[PDB]
């Protein structure tokens, strides 16, 4: 089918701008790419529900926005690149969250056939992106501090001090894909996040390493875990 991949988000100061991109790939029925359908942006603040922001039709018409983002945010699409955009301006702290790209079900045009749909349906979201996170905070970014948790049994990795989310954990490039438990992060008293990650191993020991990836600071650590 059609797949969607948001990108271009992270940490930005209040009152600043940021441009998210949504890239389409693959095709549904009749070789229909993303330019056959109408897309919306939908954001989710940490711990809350889904908020719809804006919609655009296949040809780029019938734009509309939610009152909360009207005037600040602008939707658009380069169908030649099968890409959507969201140009955010004057970013407020409550704009923080995971911004999603979501395709609408109904086919809106088939350009080579000379067929358009007279209306804009805006019906069910049958395809979503993995999401890209936007953190609006004037606090500076800081790299993660990682320390081992040496040893059925258990060996872990303690990512102690960083800001902001998210990080990416993967023990030995997905070697331990069973029994893992990357724990939800907490906000330490200092003000920087902390996080642990674990895996269960039996009496047999082989070397085990954890691969840490923190995008906003170009951080990538393959920390060891020997007894």
Nearest CB to another protein, comparing residues 112 and 189: 112
Write 216-222 long-range contacts (CB < 8 A, 24+): 216/10, 216/11, 216/141, 216/164, 217/141, 217/142, 217/143, 217/144, 217/162, 219/143, 219/144, 221/144, 221/146
Nearest CB to another protein, comparing residues 118 and 206: 118
Nearest CB to another protein, comparing residues 119 and 226: 119
Compute the least distance from the CB of residue 32 to another protein, in Å: 11
Compute the least distance from the CB of residue 62 to another protein, in Å: 11
Cα 71 to Cα 8, 64, 67, 169, distances in angstroms: 21, 11, 9, 38
Compute φ and ψ for 48, nearest 5 degrees.
-115, -165
Nearest CB to another protein, comparing residues 49 and 114: 114
Compute the least distance from the CB of residue 83 to another protein, in Å: 23
Give the footprint of another protein on this chain (CB under 8 A): 29, 105, 107, 114-119
Compute the least distance from the CB of residue 56 to another protein, in Å: 17
């Amino acid at each position: 089918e059609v797949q969607l991949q948001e990108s271009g988000g992270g940490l930005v100061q209040p009152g600043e701008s940021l441009r998210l991109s949504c890239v389409g790939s693959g095709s549904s029925f009749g070789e229909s790419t993303l330019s056959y359908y109408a897309v919306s942006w939908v954001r989710q603040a940490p711990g809350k529900g889904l908020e719809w922001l804006s919609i655009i039709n296949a040809g780029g018409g019938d734009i509309d926005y939610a009152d909360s983002v009207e005037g600040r945010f602008t939707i658009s699409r380069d169908n030649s690149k099968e890409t959507l955009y969201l140009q955010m301006t004057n970013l407020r702290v409550e704009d923080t969250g995971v911004y999603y790209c979501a395709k609408h079900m109904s086919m809106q045009q088939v350009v080579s056939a000379g067929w358009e749909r007279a209306d804009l349906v805006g019906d069910a979201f049958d395809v979503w992106g993995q999401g890209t996170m936007v953190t609006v905070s004037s606090a500076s970014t800081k790299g993660p501090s990682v320390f081992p948790l040496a040893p059925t049994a258990a060996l872990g990795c303690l990512v102690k001090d960083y800001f902001p989310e998210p990080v990416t954990v993967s023990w030995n490039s997905g070697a331990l894909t069973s029994g893992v438990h990357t724990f939800p992060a907490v906000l330490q008293s200092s003000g920087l996040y902390s996080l642990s990650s674990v895996v269960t191993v039996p009496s047999s020991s082989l070397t085990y390493i954890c691969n840490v990836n923190h995008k906003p600071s170009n951080t990538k650590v393959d920390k060891r875990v020997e007894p």
